[PDB]
């Protein structure tokens, strides 16, 4: 019993965190095998940031300009290349602690663990979701650039995010491990704003199913709804449209609890209309959208209470 | 910017998790040097049950490797299994007992294999609101003190209400609990006042000032209000501990107490503080200072 926001054990990722220095800038890098991955803006000055020509700035750099530190040891850079917004520094030593890994690009609504680092030293781990507006609501200070987001499903570490910058609203933007940003963002100081955010409907529904599994049924009602009628209501509360894929994905949870997906949608519609009324669902006074259907089946039991 | 429930990096602890089997029971153990620590319930008159056991009855697994048990003893509710091999991944550690309100990270394990990490607080009623299934027994709670891992909790059981009970690493339970199947209930819980105040200071640091007012209160008047809302009494130590946060934001502790007093009587009024519609008590003053400064491990 019990439901918590849980992160993946950060051990396999901690053994990869290094400190990357180029001139005055210092941020984090991910040392996998003989390559260190870090944001390409490490080559930039604060002045360069408005309209930087990265290809022009990188052609001016030599391997000895990049100082890489792995613990108390200095790694020797023997090559460098750029892949989209990530800088790949070839090093002379392969990481002996390199885990089994994959570079994966995630879709909005997907969750992951963030190992926040400063000076190549991990300071904390937290769980978070890729928002529909492609931003992440993280907890980052200056020096955290290069911190990575991952999932450790089964035994392989799937790197899905690398931190790059904080937007004016306090939310964060970054790339997959191939250097492609999530969202319409650029690694530039130009006026960039996060688009209006929405609630991940499929995740709130999964979390309502987890509440039913933990014995909380107070929000359930005798109504059902059409998918179209639920989306018309949900749109007005700034909720993401629920698609037929989302419904299919909630199938296992529907079967386990005995509550049809469109039956749970009717409970959600009612919760949106009435509010919590002094009550909580899984110790929360708000509808939680940072647990995917997969997370709920992973954390929750099989014998419903 | 941003405020999250953050756990310490679990790496130093993961290298210690082992699987302990005795008969049909299987739970987790903590392998530090040549000793494996686990709940004694893996084997009631515990001394009578333990005198009947031999070293080869305890099967200990560290990854794919089997560890050879060469001795066994009991310290309170923890079973200490002496093993032939010293853990090469043993970190610098201390066994510490924590006080209610203090927070820690939990590395939840099943079959000696870590599955997740989360942050939580020791409640005033000595229970922890964790996330555990069957097989999680022996999972440990810890903090990282610079470079030294401070083991403070070991999971033993789930109470009928869904909350959890356990011991420090010396086998002394937190709270009036015992390690057996009997009618045990968690006492009425209270809100950790010093932690809510620290979290209100973290909200001010993140630009959330709507709850601030021009008013102040006496410590005595605030505690009369705290007693009425099931809040733990705020002591002069708590006030002194909130000193650095008071200085950084420019809001006196008893000024922030009059903000909490108004939030207790009137509520949030459709508003949220740090994305929360409830007053959060699982961040200590030090946790707030650590997350708003960038201390690394
Ligand atoms: C201390 N504060 C205000 C900061 C400062 C900086 C933060 C940060 N880094 C940057 O933004 C660096 C940068 C600036 C301009 C363009 C790009 Cl692509 C990158 C990351 N995460 C959080 C932060 C928080
Ligand atoms: Cl995905």
Burial B276-295 (b: 16+ CB within 10 A, else e): ebbbbbbbbbebbbbbbebe
The closest CB to that of B294, out of A9, A15, A123, belongs to: A123
Closest CA to B202 of B145, B117, B276, B123: B276
Q: Around A285, how many Cα atoms within 13 Å sit in the side-chain half-sphere?
A: 16
Calculate ∠ Cα B16-B19-B25, nearest 5°: 145
Q: Which CATH architecture has domain A198-301?
A: Orthogonal Bundle (1.10)
Q: What is the CATH number of domain A15-99?
A: 2.40.10.10
Identified catalytic residue from A44, A128, A145, A300? A145
Distance in angstroms (rounded) separating the CA atoms of residues B156 and B140: 10
Best CATH choice for the domain B1-14+92-189 from the list 3.40.50.1700, 2.40.10.10, 3.30.9.10, 2.40.30.60: 2.40.10.10
Tell me, yes or no, if B207 comes closer than 8 A to chain A by beta carbon.
yes
Residues of chain B with CATH 2.40.10.10: 1-14+92-189, 15-91
Q: Is the CB of A145 under 6 A from ligand 1?
A: yes
Whether B8 contacts A125, CB under 8 Å: yes
- Give, in words, the CATH class of B15-91: mainly beta
- Superfamily of chain region B190-293: main proteinase (3clpro) structure, domain 3 (1.10.1840.10)
Tell me, yes or no, if A286 comes closer than 8 A to chain B by beta carbon.
yes
Could A283 and B129 be called an inter-chain contact, meaning their C-beta atoms sit closer than 8 Å? yes
Closest CA to B24 of B41, B10, B47, B7: B41
- Is domain A1-14+100-197 classified as CATH 2.40.10.10? yes
Q: And the tokens for A249?
A: 């994905």
Q: Can you state the percent helix, strand and coil of chain A, rounding each to 5?
A: 25, 30, 45
Whether B291 contacts A124, CB under 8 Å: yes
Ligand 1 nearest-atom number relative to CA B2: 22
Q: Which residues of A touch B3 (CB under 8 A)?
A: 139
| Contacts of residue A276, Cβ cutoff 8 Å, sequence gap at least 6 | A285, A286, B277
How far is the CA of B141 from the CAs of A70, A128, A239, A259, B109, in angstroms?
28, 22, 37, 36, 11
Classified as helix, coil or strand, B74 is strand
The closest CB to that of A125, out of B117, B129, B294, belongs to: B117
Q: And the tokens for A261?
A: 């997906």
Q: Which residues of B touch A170 (CB under 8 A)?
A: 1-2, 206-207
Q: Which residues of A touch B130 (CB under 8 A)?
A: 2, 4
| Residue numbers after which chain A breaks, C to N beyond 2.5 angstroms | none
Distance in angstroms (rounded) separating the CA atoms of residues B43 and B29: 13
Classified as helix, coil or strand, A56 is helix
**Catalytic residue list contains A145:** yes
Whether B9 contacts B133, CB under 8 Å: no
Residues of chain A with CATH 1.10.1840.10: 198-301
Resolution in A: 2.1
How far is the CA of B135 from the CAs of B1, B38, B109, B210, in angstroms?
38, 12, 8, 45
Residues of chain B with CATH 1.10.1840.10: 190-293
Q: Is the CB of A40 under 6 A from ligand 1?
A: no
Distance in angstroms (rounded) separating the CA atoms of residues A156 and A160: 12
Distance in angstroms (rounded) separating the CA atoms of residues B135 and A257: 23
Strand A157-166 and strand A101-103: the pairing is parallel
Q: CA gyration radius for chain B?
A: 21
Q: Which of A142, A148, A161 to mutate to test the pocket of ligand 1 (most atoms within 8 A of CB)?
A: A142
A260: left (phi over 0), alpha (psi -120 to 50) or beta: beta
Calculate ∠ Cα A64-A66-A71, nearest 5°: 110
Q: What is the DSSP string of A87-118?
A: EEEEESS--TT--SEEE-PPPTT-EEEEEEEE
How far is the CA of B223 from the CAs of B37, B242, B263, in angstroms?
41, 16, 14
Distance in angstroms (rounded) separating the CA atoms of residues A230 and A233: 5
């Amino acid at each position: 019993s019990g439901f918590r926001k849980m992160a993946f054990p950060s051990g396999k990722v901690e053994g990869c965190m290094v400190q990357v220095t180029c001139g005055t800038t210092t941020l984090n890098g991910l040392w996998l095998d003989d390559v260190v991955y870090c944001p390409r803006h490490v080559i930039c000055t604060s002045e360069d940031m408005l309209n930087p020509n990265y290809e022009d700035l990188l052609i001016r750099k030599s391997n000895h300009n990049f100082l890489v530190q792995a613990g108390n040891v200095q790694l020797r850079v023997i090559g460098h290349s750029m892949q989209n917004c990530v800088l790949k520094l070839k090093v002379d030593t392969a990481n002996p602690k390199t885990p089994k890994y994959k570079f994966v690009r995630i879709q909005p609504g997907q969750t992951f663990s963030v190992l926040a680092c400063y000076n190549g030293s991990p300071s904390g781990v937290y769980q978070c979701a890729m928002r529909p507006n492609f931003t992440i609501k993280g907890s980052f200070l200056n020096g955290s650039c290069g911190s990575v987001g991952f999932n450790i499903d089964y035994d392989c570490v799937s790197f899905c995010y690398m931190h790059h910058m904080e937007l004016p609203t306090g939310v964060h933007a970054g790339t997959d491990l191939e250097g492609n940003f999530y969202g319409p963002f650029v690694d530039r100081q130009t006026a960039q704003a996060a688009g209006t955010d929405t609630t991940i409907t499929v995740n709130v529904l999964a979390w309502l199913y987890a509440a039913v599994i933990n014995g909380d049924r107070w929000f359930l009602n005798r109504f059902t709804t059409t998918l179209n009628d639920f989306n018309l209501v949900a749109m007005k509360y700034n909720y993401e449209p629920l698609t037929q894929d989302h419904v299919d994905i909630l199938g296992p949870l529907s079967a386990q609890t005995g509550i049809a997906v469109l039956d749970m949608c009717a409970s959600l519609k009612e919760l949106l209309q009435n509010g919590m009324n002094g009550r909580t669902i899984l110790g929360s006074a708000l509808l939680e959208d940072e647990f995917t259907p997969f997370d709920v089946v992973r954390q929750c039991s099989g014998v419903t209470f």
